[PDB]
Amino acid sequence: MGHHHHHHSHMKHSSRLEAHLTRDELRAKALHIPFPVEKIINLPVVDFNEMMSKEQFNEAQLALIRDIRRRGKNKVAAQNCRKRKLENIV
């Protein structure tokens, strides 16, 4: 409870298909993270705290979420695009 955001951050990225499957992507499958590598970076700590209020994250998972966000710091946020068959085991 406390919805506010004054900074203009509407960066549209619809046309996205990640052939950019890094080592962090292999590690995301290994730890079975409920969000993609890209979305860990695009969610700030304040907003991400809402996600950990629902689902607890283990010591290994938090270490990966820490490392990924420092590497690919750019905001290439994939928006609503009909869904897609992502190459993943779940």
Side-chain angles (χ1 to χ4, degrees):
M1 294 62 181
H3 51 12
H4 62 277
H5 59 100
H6 190 261
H7 176 78
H8 175 63
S9 67
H10 187 77
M11 294 182 176
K12 60 183 182 306
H13 296 268
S14 182
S15 183
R16 280 183 56 78
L17 193 282
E18 286 75 281
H20 180 229
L21 305 180
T22 177
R23 294 176 57 166
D24 307 83
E25 207 289 284
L26 299 167
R27 296 168 62 196
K29 290 169 167 166
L31 300 180
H32 301 267
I33 306 297
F35 314 108
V37 176
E38 179 228 280
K39 179 161 292 183
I40 273 60
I41 312 167
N42 297 326
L43 297 176
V45 179
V46 175
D47 302 79
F48 196 84
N49 277 212
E50 184 183 89
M51 294 62 183
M52 72 180 63
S53 293
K54 309 305 186 64
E55 304 298 284
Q56 61 181 30
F57 298 105
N58 298 325
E59 60 177 281
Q61 300 183 272
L62 290 172
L64 182 61
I65 298 170
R66 198 70 57 202
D67 190 27
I68 294 182
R69 188 176 299 194
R70 304 178 302 192
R71 198 187 316 286
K73 297 179 301 185
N74 60 90
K75 333 307 308 96
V76 289
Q79 58 186 212
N80 47 271
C81 308
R82 304 296 182 156
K83 272 61 175 180
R84 51 186 172 168
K85 180 175 59 178
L86 183 63
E87 196 289 283
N88 198 275
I89 189 175
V90 184

